[PDB]
Design a protein around this ligand. Structure first.
Ligand SMILES: CN1C(=O)CN=C(c2ccccc2)c2cc(Cl)ccc21
Length: 578
């Protein structure tokens, strides 16, 4: 029995939660109740298997068990139409079907939260249904959320209420911690989405290179053979979570935290504080540990990778290992580069060897390979310098706008919401990274950017409207950022014709928060640009300035929110003029 296996290892608690997550991630539109029911039923069954390891179907794989349970509600096409088809299939096929139908952008109603008085009450009364609810809501809106990490967030969520509800000014103590968590959770989700994307679209060889480079930076002292071990495991971990096998992913992850902690001295010196805490925190901790100091005396790379004469020989023997080595060697001594830059130099090296080794004089051909690295390295360094300089002037909001304009001219087809979303993030890069010293800027900047571009990629893949977006997203995981930066303005885009419905002006905007105010104000700017790709900053600003006067006046006007109707049509007139 497998269900039993996972049960003993995780225990009632975490086993129950994980399965709730898994179900919510498969049937995102299904209600809380039903899920809870299925989870419980499923849990009961497990309990019997622990006792009798052959009872009913205790000999089954989680896929069959989990698959049949959901199918007791999925067959309801009226509710989950395209799902029924999935249940009429067999294993393992019946699952891929499920994995292929996850929505990255569910049509789920915003999730507003009641006053601090109702939450604490609901929390105190029933502490189990309050947290179960939490997981459900997150997991259904983030079908790729790193499950194990979700249990981590959960523990912190509970600690929030458990504390603030016995305070003096609940709202005061709560509100903060809850915002800080809604953010940290969004980032974590993105980070993990990229990981699943890599594995899913580019293969494990690709997820691997990424880990090798990433870990090697974190753990300079570790030895290539050690890292490889870590990389091999890590992959399986994520390979599982992304493929839907949460329980085993949850297990395996622990085993990896156990090990890394046993062999501390062989890996990093900054792991101490991580291994001394509870399991969940231990894991979260290790995953976010600062790089270790760089080993004192380190030979040069040129020695064994360009100057040696057995290069082409070693390359032909086990190119995989030789390149894996090159990457590990370049990374460890360069924590100032981004994972992608590294994988980039690596790919350059490989390509070189490939052509050189088949030449009349190898060592002569691949002799000046570090010359080629020079450009690839300075590029990001320069772009990062520019962009922070700008950001440092414009501030976050105006920086987002600049970026919003630019990307819209690049891929006008892309739906306004996505472009507004994506460009808003693309700007956080500035506030998040720019405040670091050169030595730490690039990894912060370029890898974060890799996440934000993955979003645009996935969101787009749902309904592909621009081939230029498609090319850049599918051509090379490592080269996405450069590919997008190459794009100028689409010269074949034919502007849209205005419409009353293109944008509505209900007065309901005067009630929204300050943020949702900028957001409509930005959703406009996008909209404008799609109509007049050919305007420059002068007319846009001017018009945008105006759009402001409109909301202030008409919102502060005593008339029954109709100036919105009249003045709404008034601006359209002014606008078209520019
Ligand atoms: C989103 N974005 C761009 O499109 C311009 N290119 C970059 C960039 C260029 C090279 C590496 C990483 C990032 C960049 C840099 C900052 Cl500091 C802020 C936004 C931004």
């Amino acid at each position: 029995s497998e269900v039993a296996h996972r049960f003993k290892d995780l225990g009632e608690e975490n086993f129950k939660a994980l399965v709730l997550i898994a179900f919510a991630q498969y049937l995102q539109q299904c209600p809380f109740e039903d899920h809870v029911k299925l989870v419980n039923e499923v849990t009961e069954f497990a309990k019997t298997c622990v006792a009798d390891e052959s009872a009913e179907n205790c000999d089954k794989s989680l896929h069959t068990l989990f698959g049949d349970k959901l199918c007791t509600v999925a067959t309801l096409r009226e509710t989950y139409g395209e799902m029924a088809d999935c249940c009429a299939k067999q294993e393992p096929e019946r699952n891929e079907c499920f994995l292929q139908h996850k929505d990255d952008n569910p049509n789920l109603p915003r999730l507003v939260r009641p006053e601090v008085d109702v939450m604490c009450t609901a929390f105190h009364d029933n502490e189990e249904t309050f947290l179960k609810k939490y997981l459900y809501e997150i997991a259904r809106r983030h079908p790729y959320f790193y499950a194990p990490e979700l249990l981590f967030f959960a523990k912190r969520y509970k600690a929030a209420f458990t504390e603030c509800c016995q305070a003096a000014d609940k709202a005061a103590c709560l509100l903060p911690k809850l915002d800080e968590l809604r953010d940290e959770g969004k980032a974590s989700s993105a980070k993990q989405r990229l990981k699943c994307a890599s594995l899913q679209k580019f293969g494990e060889r690709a997820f691997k290179a990424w880990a090798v480079a990433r870990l090697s930076q974190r753990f300079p002292k570790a030895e290539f053979a050690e890292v490889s071990k870590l990389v091999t495991d890590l992959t399986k971990v994520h390979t599982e979570c992304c493929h839907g096998d949460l329980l085993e992913c949850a297990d395996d992850r622990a085993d990896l935290a156990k090990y890394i902690c046993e062999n501390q001295d062989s890996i990093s010196s900054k792991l101490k504080e991580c291994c001394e805490k509870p399991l969940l925190e231990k894991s979260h901790c290790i995953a976010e540990v600062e790089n270790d100091e760089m080993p004192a005396d380190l030979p040069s790379l040129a020695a064994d990778f360009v100057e040696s004469k057995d290069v082409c020989k070693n390359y032909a023997e086990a190119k995989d290992v030789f390149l894996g080595m090159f990457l590990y060697e370049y990374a460890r001594r360069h924590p100032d580069y981004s994972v992608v830059l590294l994988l980039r130099l690596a790919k350059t090296y490989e390509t070189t060897l490939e052509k050189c080794c088949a030449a009349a004089d190898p060592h002569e051909c691949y002799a000046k390979v570090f010359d080629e690295f020079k450009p690839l390295v300075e590029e990001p360094q320069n772009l990062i310098k520019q962009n922070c300089e700008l950001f440092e002037q414009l501030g976050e909001y105006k920086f987002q706008n600049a970026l919003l304009v630019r990307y819209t001219k690049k891929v006008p087809q892309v739906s306004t919401p996505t472009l507004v979303e994506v460009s808003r993030n693309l700007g956080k890069v500035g506030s998040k990274c720019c405040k670091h010293p050169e030595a730490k800027r690039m990894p912060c900047a370029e890898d974060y950017l890799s996440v934000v571009l993955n979003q645009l990629c996935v969101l787009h893949e749902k309904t592909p409207v621009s081939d230029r977006v498609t090319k850049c997203c599918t051509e090379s995981l490592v080269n996405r950022r450069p590919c997008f930066s190459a794009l100028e303005v689409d010269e074949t885009y034919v502007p849209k014709e205005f419409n009353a419905e293109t944008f509505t002006f209900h007065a309901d905007i005067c009630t929204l928060s300050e943020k949702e105010r900028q957001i409509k104000k930005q959703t406009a700017l996008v909209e404008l640009v799609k109509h007049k790709p050919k305007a420059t900053k002068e007319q846009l600003k001017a018009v945008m300035d105006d759009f402001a006067a409109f909301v202030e006046k008409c919102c502060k006007a005593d008339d029954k929110e109709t100036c919105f109707a009249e003045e709404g049509k008034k601006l359209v007139a002014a606008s078209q003029a520019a």
